[PDB]
């Protein structure tokens, strides 16, 4: 027949066998789910706070919290766009509490980090060309951005095993509190945009949705919850300490830049297109306008400090050791090809090394358009990196710089954008540059873990199936919900009740503007708590 | 303290079995609808799962433009039924099978998603090969695949019949008027083969199980209501919209081919319009309708179409020639002097260089506001009775390049299902309101819970693990009249002077009913009531 | 608030609690990421040995091999193969004092990790590593130093701590055999490979998640060990002997380039799509294909047939018409077409495989400033096979014509590609050269197919886009159950798996015909892991 005779003869007895072809269908707990949406109470350092009260005899349990936000219509002049994943960037803090106190809470950045491997959650929060590309308003009544609604998935420990992990409401009042970051953090704009009026007129319009469960004869049992706690080290300090560590499931270490010493203005931004190449291309495109000029005699509208040299017959312009090959086609007979040899330059001493952005170009080819009176570039050979695109404009014109610094046109400088994204990691927009050369984790006096390479980040990325992980030390490899989590146990008598993190940062060149980008060390500790349901919901720190 | 061993486990001896990949040839029968029947009857085939239907696509020869719809294999399916002597065990509608497999990239790729299959190929001579023959594989996802051998269909001492109903070849093909579809429709035959993983089980211990059977109800044209009757034990309910193109000839201006992103659809449309939009001619252009308003671009480069300014600058234009702009390529209006929807007004800057060698304009950069809706407008709606203007002011050359698109699984009012046309959703169990929403939070939950980017407004009643538990369902009350699910939507009001306002809509409601699988004297299913 | 319809519907049978669970106290343990430096030994094959013996390491899993790639300085073109880290591996073996516990061939480890995007990215997949960089001066930096991470996926990772390798006071030795550096590098003739091969050293480090278990309760387990048999060159048969309890059997083909210098005209670099391979090839040919010259072009062999494009624009190469139109061509210059850039034939007046005939339209604009043609649009029929033809086959003895009629400039840009994990007869494994597959268990036919339905099932069941014709015998959940296997009958001679394929035949006038094939058959045998007086494995028979 259809089965091969070799198989039939091989089969056609005494040993006890587990049934792999049938199973006894277990009757589950009688329940009924419902998607419930609630309007909050807004309160106003005049920080916006949204409060959602959940109290209903029939809402036995809940999970999968989703916060929706109504983004308004943006009208006026100038350039405006929203940061990618705008919804997550709105969040400063989220708290879930009962009458007995806080059950679970997370910092805005930590919620975002936990959802970074979820493409759907990230897309829902606001990742579109409509939202993230930098739109321009021409008249005071021109529409820059159309109104839109974003959805932020507040991932909680109650979602891990669906109904099994759900937050039970033992006839108690659950309060979900959401603290919002200033609108400055979620917006990318130029000087021409009236941010002053926008900041006044903007209001966060939130709504909290969750999956509620009406359970008939619920059999509540105690559980365990991991609560994240972060410590931010002092500016440019390679150390941070998490105190009162008694039962931790994990410890994450990362770096964040600090732009308080700057006006938060950057030359370029790629918009919705967020790849490393997109950031580089947007920067190169912004510089090329002033870098290669086709003019009738020496170019005008540039500072006296600018050194604009006419390209010789051979096409090669020498900027010290660096040779720039510039060849433009269809150049009018009355005009010549010019190169800005010091577009952006930095130096600490009057005759030492100089970081010149024009030296980072080797070949520039294109064709001059008679119709539009502009140069259309064909191919650019350069060495521009993600760090260059991540340099705040202030650092080019800083007191440390002996040169003018910014030798661009006033037209180009007016196109600069303010970027206040609250969740930037490393020293660049893509968190590409690893500035941690060594990591040392001490549990008291004893060295708990040490590494010279980011193998803890490699393990984090593999074990969580994420492409954007952090240097994480995982202590729990036991299946969640069905088992009590494995934790690092303290010894208060021996002074082993704290985790001290020490990093060795990379040594950067003083004549490179990135040296002055201030760094902050972020250490995240996941503490183990026991969820008790005896006379309301309550949590107790495992010690 | 007593501790659970997390470092070692007792290796359980499983049921003695042997799997085999079995492929079968069907029986073809012919509204003259193609039906394939596969009979599975073998004493040694104890259980089966993972049904894969293969299709041998023929060589396409001749003249004109031709291409297959993306995921061609799934689009071929109209209906699939798995039945025994006692009747239907499980059945699904073609679109519902596709929806269940939309998150599976591998299944979608196997069904036919390649530049070879989906790009629009052109045949120059009557014997020129447009498309080479190919074999596509359609994964018929069934409830028997969920927990592999545990969920498998047991067919010990029973004849299982797998029936596949095929959609007309018109649905799976994108072609122009030049292509001889008449001959193709006659000459085309579906060549199917059904593969499945069969299990020869020694001393099988069969137990009863539960199965979710999908039921869809399609409402009438433009009716914002649909009702699913005799709902007694449902695990989920999905609501979506489908466009109806019966009032049209199913012809569209452009198609991107294999490249399926929203931008790909937009770029293909812009590219098709640019041929007539900016013209380099020796005096006023010819070959356009009298209704066309082709204006010469001034020295300034700016052409004003009412409130809209179009910047047109072309390089290397011959001294005897001028640059022209079609100011009303596609226009729509319900009244003489009302709001006019002009496609030429959706362009702000057009730059390029004229080629002396090829005697054509090579466009460099286009600044425009063209959307996914524009690319999804059937040509018929531009020239409809409701339009006071001519509508289609393109050249006869451009109109001849229009393609017929009859894809059976289109959702919403656009090719990417980007635009949400449902403003409100109301679901009623009997007469009482079961669920209501003003935002697509049920779609957001569906997309999150299923880890899908192409979800639907779904109400899930079952959050209990499948196979190992009896599914949680919405229970009926026949005495109280709660034995039906009524869906009512409020469609979002669009502008009357926009052609997409005239795309007819059909409401689709999908209900997953719970059934009990019994193996006492053959395989049989019983509706849970 | 809950809807009244739901409340009324709810407000004796034994029910399983789906809203709460008893949190079981697990085995007391403490994990640790442990990194170890090896011992390097060296015909003259690099071998790394890692010894694991510690009282505080009871169990281990998730082996990750780090490799320090050095700074590459000098002249010429250089780049690393995609997923460089995996390509470095020739063999990996985990053994105890009682012998080998588990081992895998380099290609098989890569195949098992092909469905893991993270593992592949970690091993080295970046424009920095995989794009072909050029060194201009003898001290110019071609490639900056980098660290790659190779995830050695083992059966101990399946169910985390449950599947982990237990070290019952025994010494575990992890041995990694490395492929020559030639295999992981794409370079031109200009690049001093001789010095590079001498100066290059594999710098490995083995990381693993170690577990310190208090009062471990060890129980025996089951392990699947992969075995592969490589058939005789071009032979459509291969046999795996002593098959007693196998969980699966995979069949695939590999090309063999021993009859060539392993040089190829083009390479896309980091961009690895079929189109990227094609575009890179077209771009490399266009330099010599369309020439703007003051009179007939020079610097080409006498064998080259370079025809001036007529006023019409169409050049006829027998049956094939090539439309060539270039803008801004100087008055003193003309447009030329190389009508036989690459040509092949086994007979003097028979069928010719001409690469120039594979082009229908070539448009562009001449640049006065750079004195070169900037191509705008190319209409062609170039395929993945064309890009996969070794240069040697164009100039082979079988070819009556010269073959390679390109310029010396173009020929100097050719790259050596020695990637050890190539499948099929093309770089993308696009062409399916197996027409039929027959698998025999002893003398009886176990399975046969005319279409790759076993590959389709493999791709679906493993959620992979790069699967192989695989026969799976085990559909039982791993670790918690003893795997289901094919059962041998030694008395009936049913103790071996014999694979016979029917290959489709290529055209003899197409250079690809001369690409050698190798049939690869992979068998996963079932073994029992015993911990009684050290770790040991026993073949299930």
PDB file of N, CA, C and O in Angstrom, chain B residues 359-389:
ATOM      1  N   UNK B 359      16.066  59.600 -26.848  1.00  0.00           N
ATOM      2  CA  UNK B 359      14.969  60.552 -27.088  1.00  0.00           C
ATOM      3  C   UNK B 359      13.868  60.449 -26.007  1.00  0.00           C
ATOM      4  O   UNK B 359      12.675  60.390 -26.326  1.00  0.00           O
ATOM      5  N   UNK B 360      14.286  60.390 -24.724  1.00  0.00           N
ATOM      6  CA  UNK B 360      13.376  60.276 -23.580  1.00  0.00           C
ATOM      7  C   UNK B 360      13.904  60.975 -22.321  1.00  0.00           C
ATOM      8  O   UNK B 360      15.105  61.226 -22.218  1.00  0.00           O
ATOM      9  N   UNK B 361      13.000  61.285 -21.370  1.00  0.00           N
ATOM     10  CA  UNK B 361      13.355  61.945 -20.114  1.00  0.00           C
ATOM     11  C   UNK B 361      13.681  60.914 -19.046  1.00  0.00           C
ATOM     12  O   UNK B 361      12.896  59.993 -18.808  1.00  0.00           O
ATOM     13  N   UNK B 362      14.854  61.071 -18.418  1.00  0.00           N
ATOM     14  CA  UNK B 362      15.335  60.210 -17.346  1.00  0.00           C
ATOM     15  C   UNK B 362      15.176  61.018 -16.070  1.00  0.00           C
ATOM     16  O   UNK B 362      15.934  61.960 -15.841  1.00  0.00           O
ATOM     17  N   UNK B 363      14.155  60.680 -15.270  1.00  0.00           N
ATOM     18  CA  UNK B 363      13.836  61.374 -14.021  1.00  0.00           C
ATOM     19  C   UNK B 363      14.834  61.052 -12.921  1.00  0.00           C
ATOM     20  O   UNK B 363      15.222  59.894 -12.764  1.00  0.00           O
ATOM     21  N   UNK B 364      15.278  62.087 -12.192  1.00  0.00           N
ATOM     22  CA  UNK B 364      16.268  61.977 -11.124  1.00  0.00           C
ATOM     23  C   UNK B 364      15.638  61.936  -9.737  1.00  0.00           C
ATOM     24  O   UNK B 364      15.960  61.037  -8.956  1.00  0.00           O
ATOM     25  N   UNK B 365      14.775  62.916  -9.414  1.00  0.00           N
ATOM     26  CA  UNK B 365      14.120  62.999  -8.112  1.00  0.00           C
ATOM     27  C   UNK B 365      12.707  63.534  -8.228  1.00  0.00           C
ATOM     28  O   UNK B 365      12.480  64.545  -8.894  1.00  0.00           O
ATOM     29  N   UNK B 366      11.760  62.855  -7.561  1.00  0.00           N
ATOM     30  CA  UNK B 366      10.352  63.232  -7.539  1.00  0.00           C
ATOM     31  C   UNK B 366       9.910  63.475  -6.100  1.00  0.00           C
ATOM     32  O   UNK B 366      10.037  62.585  -5.255  1.00  0.00           O
ATOM     33  N   UNK B 367       9.397  64.685  -5.825  1.00  0.00           N
ATOM     34  CA  UNK B 367       8.822  65.059  -4.533  1.00  0.00           C
ATOM     35  C   UNK B 367       7.313  65.014  -4.742  1.00  0.00           C
ATOM     36  O   UNK B 367       6.787  65.725  -5.607  1.00  0.00           O
ATOM     37  N   UNK B 368       6.630  64.110  -4.025  1.00  0.00           N
ATOM     38  CA  UNK B 368       5.189  63.905  -4.169  1.00  0.00           C
ATOM     39  C   UNK B 368       4.522  63.460  -2.866  1.00  0.00           C
ATOM     40  O   UNK B 368       5.211  63.144  -1.892  1.00  0.00           O
ATOM     41  N   UNK B 369       3.173  63.386  -2.879  1.00  0.00           N
ATOM     42  CA  UNK B 369       2.334  62.958  -1.758  1.00  0.00           C
ATOM     43  C   UNK B 369       1.402  61.775  -2.122  1.00  0.00           C
ATOM     44  O   UNK B 369       0.365  61.587  -1.479  1.00  0.00           O
ATOM     45  N   UNK B 370       1.795  60.969  -3.134  1.00  0.00           N
ATOM     46  CA  UNK B 370       1.060  59.781  -3.600  1.00  0.00           C
ATOM     47  C   UNK B 370       1.025  58.739  -2.462  1.00  0.00           C
ATOM     48  O   UNK B 370       2.058  58.477  -1.843  1.00  0.00           O
ATOM     49  N   UNK B 371      -0.156  58.161  -2.197  1.00  0.00           N
ATOM     50  CA  UNK B 371      -0.348  57.163  -1.146  1.00  0.00           C
ATOM     51  C   UNK B 371      -0.763  55.782  -1.682  1.00  0.00           C
ATOM     52  O   UNK B 371      -0.970  55.623  -2.889  1.00  0.00           O
ATOM     53  N   UNK B 372      -0.890  54.790  -0.771  1.00  0.00           N
ATOM     54  CA  UNK B 372      -1.280  53.415  -1.084  1.00  0.00           C
ATOM     55  C   UNK B 372      -2.717  53.324  -1.645  1.00  0.00           C
ATOM     56  O   UNK B 372      -3.012  52.415  -2.430  1.00  0.00           O
ATOM     57  N   UNK B 373      -3.592  54.278  -1.256  1.00  0.00           N
ATOM     58  CA  UNK B 373      -4.973  54.330  -1.729  1.00  0.00           C
ATOM     59  C   UNK B 373      -4.978  54.643  -3.233  1.00  0.00           C
ATOM     60  O   UNK B 373      -5.667  53.958  -3.991  1.00  0.00           O
ATOM     61  N   UNK B 374      -4.171  55.641  -3.661  1.00  0.00           N
ATOM     62  CA  UNK B 374      -4.049  56.062  -5.059  1.00  0.00           C
ATOM     63  C   UNK B 374      -3.714  54.909  -5.987  1.00  0.00           C
ATOM     64  O   UNK B 374      -4.305  54.790  -7.059  1.00  0.00           O
ATOM     65  N   UNK B 375      -2.790  54.042  -5.545  1.00  0.00           N
ATOM     66  CA  UNK B 375      -2.319  52.861  -6.270  1.00  0.00           C
ATOM     67  C   UNK B 375      -3.380  51.754  -6.273  1.00  0.00           C
ATOM     68  O   UNK B 375      -3.290  50.828  -7.075  1.00  0.00           O
ATOM     69  N   UNK B 376      -4.361  51.838  -5.363  1.00  0.00           N
ATOM     70  CA  UNK B 376      -5.427  50.850  -5.199  1.00  0.00           C
ATOM     71  C   UNK B 376      -6.771  51.258  -5.819  1.00  0.00           C
ATOM     72  O   UNK B 376      -7.768  50.541  -5.661  1.00  0.00           O
ATOM     73  N   UNK B 377      -6.802  52.390  -6.538  1.00  0.00           N
ATOM     74  CA  UNK B 377      -8.026  52.857  -7.182  1.00  0.00           C
ATOM     75  C   UNK B 377      -8.241  52.116  -8.514  1.00  0.00           C
ATOM     76  O   UNK B 377      -7.399  52.251  -9.411  1.00  0.00           O
ATOM     77  N   UNK B 378      -9.361  51.367  -8.693  1.00  0.00           N
ATOM     78  CA  UNK B 378      -9.618  50.743 -10.005  1.00  0.00           C
ATOM     79  C   UNK B 378      -9.877  51.846 -11.029  1.00  0.00           C
ATOM     80  O   UNK B 378     -10.518  52.848 -10.697  1.00  0.00           O
ATOM     81  N   UNK B 379      -9.335  51.684 -12.253  1.00  0.00           N
ATOM     82  CA  UNK B 379      -9.423  52.651 -13.360  1.00  0.00           C
ATOM     83  C   UNK B 379     -10.878  53.095 -13.634  1.00  0.00           C
ATOM     84  O   UNK B 379     -11.114  54.279 -13.889  1.00  0.00           O
ATOM     85  N   UNK B 380     -11.841  52.155 -13.519  1.00  0.00           N
ATOM     86  CA  UNK B 380     -13.275  52.376 -13.722  1.00  0.00           C
ATOM     87  C   UNK B 380     -13.831  53.531 -12.870  1.00  0.00           C
ATOM     88  O   UNK B 380     -14.674  54.289 -13.353  1.00  0.00           O
ATOM     89  N   UNK B 381     -13.356  53.664 -11.617  1.00  0.00           N
ATOM     90  CA  UNK B 381     -13.809  54.700 -10.690  1.00  0.00           C
ATOM     91  C   UNK B 381     -13.379  56.116 -11.087  1.00  0.00           C
ATOM     92  O   UNK B 381     -14.030  57.083 -10.680  1.00  0.00           O
ATOM     93  N   UNK B 382     -12.323  56.247 -11.903  1.00  0.00           N
ATOM     94  CA  UNK B 382     -11.886  57.551 -12.397  1.00  0.00           C
ATOM     95  C   UNK B 382     -12.826  57.995 -13.516  1.00  0.00           C
ATOM     96  O   UNK B 382     -13.055  59.185 -13.667  1.00  0.00           O
ATOM     97  N   UNK B 383     -13.371  57.036 -14.295  1.00  0.00           N
ATOM     98  CA  UNK B 383     -14.273  57.294 -15.427  1.00  0.00           C
ATOM     99  C   UNK B 383     -15.747  56.939 -15.123  1.00  0.00           C
ATOM    100  O   UNK B 383     -16.541  56.774 -16.051  1.00  0.00           O
ATOM    101  N   UNK B 384     -16.111  56.841 -13.830  1.00  0.00           N
ATOM    102  CA  UNK B 384     -17.464  56.495 -13.388  1.00  0.00           C
ATOM    103  C   UNK B 384     -18.503  57.580 -13.693  1.00  0.00           C
ATOM    104  O   UNK B 384     -18.131  58.723 -13.980  1.00  0.00           O
ATOM    105  N   UNK B 385     -19.807  57.213 -13.631  1.00  0.00           N
ATOM    106  CA  UNK B 385     -20.945  58.110 -13.885  1.00  0.00           C
ATOM    107  C   UNK B 385     -20.962  59.296 -12.921  1.00  0.00           C
ATOM    108  O   UNK B 385     -21.278  60.409 -13.342  1.00  0.00           O
ATOM    109  N   UNK B 386     -20.580  59.058 -11.642  1.00  0.00           N
ATOM    110  CA  UNK B 386     -20.511  60.047 -10.559  1.00  0.00           C
ATOM    111  C   UNK B 386     -19.497  61.169 -10.843  1.00  0.00           C
ATOM    112  O   UNK B 386     -19.578  62.236 -10.224  1.00  0.00           O
ATOM    113  N   UNK B 387     -18.562  60.937 -11.786  1.00  0.00           N
ATOM    114  CA  UNK B 387     -17.559  61.923 -12.167  1.00  0.00           C
ATOM    115  C   UNK B 387     -18.023  62.822 -13.318  1.00  0.00           C
ATOM    116  O   UNK B 387     -18.244  62.351 -14.442  1.00  0.00           O
ATOM    117  N   UNK B 388     -18.128  64.131 -13.025  1.00  0.00           N
ATOM    118  CA  UNK B 388     -18.531  65.172 -13.976  1.00  0.00           C
ATOM    119  C   UNK B 388     -17.432  65.445 -15.011  1.00  0.00           C
ATOM    120  O   UNK B 388     -17.721  65.970 -16.087  1.00  0.00           O
ATOM    121  N   UNK B 389     -16.180  65.098 -14.676  1.00  0.00           N
ATOM    122  CA  UNK B 389     -15.016  65.280 -15.546  1.00  0.00           C
ATOM    123  C   UNK B 389     -14.768  64.023 -16.368  1.00  0.00           C
ATOM    124  O   UNK B 389     -15.428  63.003 -16.137  1.00  0.00           O
TER     125      UNK B 389
END
